[PDB]
Symmetry: D2
Subunit: 422 residues, 4 copies
């Protein structure tokens, strides 16, 4: 029964052609949905009650579009998101962190615009987790956004939006200085011929996967759902293909900001992503990601590859990792394990930000501290196992891989352990 579910017959195929031939509509997904959903907040999704339904449907990142609305309007959206998120904090073993992303207006006809400087300052003051920087054309555009965030916004992630020909041509220099990328297909499809956008999307997703940096696929994914309860055949195909391409995140714009079916649009992206994730050909994907990642002397990079390899060997249900900044979980995520990466962190911001990395399931640790560091570490590892059992990630008899470090503080991950559940 186990080997009939989650496209396991297709997973064992010897060629990609055979893998396609073995895909089965009756093979049900079992793993948790790995690709994060970004939902744009607007009139259709602003109320606290509506936001609670969207969190339950699978929204992981709330996008604030600073192209429209005042600072007062966006501050109320942030407060409503935080109120809806915290209404589930009463059960810490099931609570879902939700990131807040600020999408800038852009340069317009101009460097960094004066409105963007003000909006970025607003973001730092209101504690946003991510910035989606509009119309990034070169590395100096990213440096200007980084400078406008100041010393208090040092921890905010910058996702550069590639929306034009220059951004595509200067992609490598932009990615090098960014935390990740957004394939902003709306403007990109107007700036370059519409029939070429898929080449830019697939190239950028491939290069981000190679670099181990988050990549977002965005715009018109479920467009018809703005007025209709069900999407078109092209729309479900687009969502599935963005996941199969290797996108870490998928996005909804008008579908959630102004449409008549915001909750249904989130549920549809969730349903398709789970199906597409099981249809991934991990055998080739892992081998290629492994070969293309360079040799390293960083113990976190060395432990990550060892843990992902160990997970595939035993069909591990999860890789539990302790992380302060989210970096150890991100280095596991870059090899696209089938095993869920359960990230146990004390940082509420890192818990929100790791939604950018595919397959990272954040658990915010709020249990009392232990006097002995080693005892505290073990307690955090047991917390990950207990949340995993409660949420259905783990069952008795499963094997898990546990990733920890040799001393407190970030940057010291160097240990991988094989543990049998219960």
């Amino acid at each position: 029964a186990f080997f009939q579910q989650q496209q396991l017959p297709a997973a064992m195929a010897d060629t990609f052609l055979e893998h396609l031939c073995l895909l089965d509509i009756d093979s049900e997904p079992v793993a948790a949905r790995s690709t994060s959903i970004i939902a744009t907040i607007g009139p259709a999704s602003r109320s606290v009650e509506r936001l609670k339904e969207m969190i339950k449907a699978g929204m992981n990142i709330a996008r604030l579009n600073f192209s429209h609305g005042s600072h007062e309007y966006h501050a109320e959206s942030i407060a409503n998101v935080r109120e809806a998120v915290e209404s589930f904090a009463g059960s810490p073993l099931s609570y879902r962190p939700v990131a807040i992303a600020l999408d800038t207006k852009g340069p317009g006809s101009g460097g960094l615009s004066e409105q963007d400087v003000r909006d970025l300052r607003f973001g730092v003051e209101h504690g946003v987790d991510i910035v989606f920087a509009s119309f990034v054309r070169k590395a100096s555009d990213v440096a200007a956004v980084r400078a406008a965030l100041g010393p208090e916004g040092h921890g905010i992630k910058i996702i550069s939006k590639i929306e034009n020909h220059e951004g595509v041509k200067r992609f490598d220099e932009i990615l090098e200085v960014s935390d990740g990328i957004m394939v902003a297909r709306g403007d990109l499809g107007i700036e370059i011929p519409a029939e070429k956008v898929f080449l830019a999307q697939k190239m950028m997703i491939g290069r981000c996967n190679l670099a181990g940096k988050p990549v977002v696929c965005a715009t018109q994914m479920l467009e018809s759902m703005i007025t209709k309860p069900r999407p078109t055949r092209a729309e479900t195909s687009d969502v599935a293909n963005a996941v199969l391409d290797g996108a870490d995140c998928i996005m909804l714009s008008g579908e959630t900001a102004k449409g008549n079916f915001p909750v249904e649009a989130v549920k549809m992206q969730h349903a398709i992503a789970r199906e597409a994730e099981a249809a991934v050909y991990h055998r080739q994907l892992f081998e290629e990601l492994r070969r293309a990642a360079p040799l390293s002397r960083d113990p976190t990079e060395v432990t990550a590859i060892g843990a992902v390899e160990a997970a595939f060997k035993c069909c591990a249900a999860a890789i539990i990792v302790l992380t302060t900044t989210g970096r150890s979980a991100q280095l596991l995520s870059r090899y696209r394990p089938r095993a869920a990466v359960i990230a146990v962190t004390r940082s509420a911001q890192a818990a929100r930000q790791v939604h950018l990395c595919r397959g990272v399931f954040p658990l915010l640790y709020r249990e009392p501290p232990e006097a002995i560091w080693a005892d505290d570490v073990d307690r955090r590892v047991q917390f990950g196992i207990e949340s995993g059992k409660l949420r259905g990630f783990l069952r008795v008899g499963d094997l898990v891989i546990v990733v920890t470090g040799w001393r407190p503080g970030s940057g010291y991950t160097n240990i991988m352990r094989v543990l049998s559940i219960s």
Copy 2:
């Protein structure tokens, strides 16, 4: 000999990559497609695309197959659509650079227990009006195909039957349906209502994979450019869907309401043409050929053996084309199954095989009508030179190019066994 400019076009840097990940990383929006568009476009005929003048514009935009939807309209209405298609096609019979065969496909209303009474009458109409293909609605099992085949009566055995898979049973009984069909249509409209909408992509990719493995045509259909029914430009998801159907391995892509009733039928055909050319150059032939080769069983059929030899030879020299002589279209279909980058120029005397080979990706049919030569070897050489001269006129070939030529040792279908490497003079 070819130059660095040649190796920058048609995604050739991405083509030479050693991994699929590296292939994706090397895709270039500035690398322009050079080869002719190889995925055929099927356009549904209706009020928005019925006039002879509108049909001429759709033929120029790239329509290769005209679909008649027998779910609506009378026999008199469909006979007029067929006459208008044939008139528009024959208006270019004077200019060799623009004349192209256009297939006529009858899409049945559907079943009720066995084959419906209306389907028996419509299939008989199809034979009487000389349709090339039947898109059989709601095929659920092999006996449904046998019933459609029996309705093609005594005179319609040459008509191709493309089974439409529109429900759960059709997906589960896929292997037995494909075995007795000429090809398959992934009919996503009904399929997306019969099975959960989030599962349609799995059924599409599985069926395309299985058809590619079997070497049989597969059509991707429904809502590909849906928003173009009322808008002049499609959504980002729609262009992505067309590109991904081509990258999945679909031989044909289809337009329904977009060309039957929408406000932009010609623009919808142009958009599918533009995306297909881009997606075809982005195919990773290196792995696709290796996998088609490894999965395909050993063969002692000389046509199959010649086809793989010719496709291998074409990749070795970057051949501009493979010219094949075919009576039924079978030799061209066996070349097409290995997905060569080189265009497969099929020279045939059969007007029906010329229209029907549009079902096979990369097959460019040429209808030959010169009177037979007394010496068979001379008649063969005249047809080979006809394909070279048409290729030179249409942009496929130039003097100095290498072409692969596929022929047989004696007249009649079934004797293909020769592959020659020719330098264009």
Copy 3:
């Protein structure tokens, strides 16, 4: 270049010219062969063990000390010739030569003692002489038995029974010497600790032109099963009378290593020849060159693809540790082992990194020479009060011995493999450590 550029700037271009590293990074086996370089010097310690047959030419304590220094890891006693009194004196001389180096625990070399049986002869089962010789082996504490003419699983069960209750820890290496042994290979391997491709009798029992097929098949199947395989007979035959071997002989040694043999053997070359020490040095020199010429990239991928999924934490930790070692060009994998099993599971994935096995068992230290790339360290210190501290002291002993022995340098990365509780069978931890 992008996959090695940063590590090349850090370790230097000189590092990446040695140990056939340009050939190691090749994308095809054809390109790997094209990049093999006679100027690319081996750096790693020799990982294929050398078995030397003891006889008149290699029996003295002084001669045995020179053979231990040349690289002999396993001493073979051929019970086809010589009395029990003769073999007991050979064992005592081996032990005296081995223990003459025990003064420095950080450099001491354990040497296994293997008893090679006379065989069944014309009989169907275990001969009466074999029953007596196997009982002699148990009484004299031999580590391994090379069982002659194994033809089926019941032959190994009979050898196991003759060893009795006291010889349960002795390893049984079944010698495949005839057609039936080749045909019944799978059932023989299943119940044996390992295999010996006994080419002398095999080359008489089957056509001489087919022996290479049997050798390559058996080595492949043992590599797949993760069990030791020995290549034996006439490897350096001409060295019995000549100081240098033939071109076919050096080729045969190199090819046995490239095939995947864990051990290579010398018979007459060391037992009766005029150059026993030079024969050991020649096998050592060739094995070092051939080990660096292994195409690890495909070998590791294929061992992974062919090996079934495992739910054993020692097995899962072993593959994780070998993967981690390849990622950082680790100088060594240090493993704590009671029976040698954790080191054997690391060894089955053929890491380029040396597997330094720290054990308290003197017998396990001798027996792990059967597994390619396992370097045994005998830990003589009594247990610490706190188990976690005792574990750390053994790891530090491995690091300090590794530094003094040239395996490790300051700045190197090492992979450390340990377990969660005392006793055999609980290995489940892998750590990445930087040498200070």
Copy 4:
């Protein structure tokens, strides 16, 4: 039939990994293909008798080596005459006649820097006596090959030069030496004294790999079956060395003292023959072909393009043979570089090309003696039929086998461009 798939290591051939390929090797799986690695036997007191030379030709000797390090010109001229008399004693049956090449192995430069005066005299003797090949001793750089070529003069332009790599400089300057040579000999005797003995296998495997990549012949030589000089059976290391030279990719294997002076010259040839057939069936063609294919550059030469198409076609149908018509041996050499499992039966009118193609693995030369037919197409067909009849008589072919036929579009060298699938009747 199931019996077919149990022989010639076919279960191991179908394996998905090299590890699984090794695990499936079977000592009971008998070789079926003809032995494709050529045997070079050194001539001397033990192999000069015309009657003994006849036995060595029947045992499998393809190339007779004359070692000019020992013996006078008068002695070597007698060797040549005895070889030619033994070879020509079988010319009365053209369907079974086996050409045998004559190779002159030079004494070398000794302590000098360039071509020695004795080598200039021996090379002129070789041209005057019509030798086919020169094994040039101690080649250290490209200018050494140019000096050998100059000493052969205008009359020796057709002689093949095989450079012997015997020292450190020859290994370091390998690429420049191979570029100007026809092939290479891994001369292990001197190489094993010039460089550490434990490094010779690295040089042998590297040189064989580079020659396979270049598509140029490579010979493995010295002490392969050394103990057979005095003993009737070789050592386990000797049979292993022969098998491993074949598995490495050597086109030729050599016997020196074993045939020149030993007591078992005929048995030594039979032993190399027996091991080579076993080792050739144990080759993992699946990976070897893919790697030779990927490493070979794109080509616009029709002979090169036809060769890869024909090898691919041969694997698809399990062709028993590829019959090629060749004037210089080049078309057969280009087929040979892709290491087909199918025997390459080369039909030629050039007696010298027939002898020289033994340097290329898997090329079985047939000397056609009939004068040209009036109609060129008939002359081509007669040669193809001669290839089929010889192949049937020798056991290469049976009725029902598929064969790939490689020919050209016009007479003369350099025009191969046709590949034909033919059923043996």
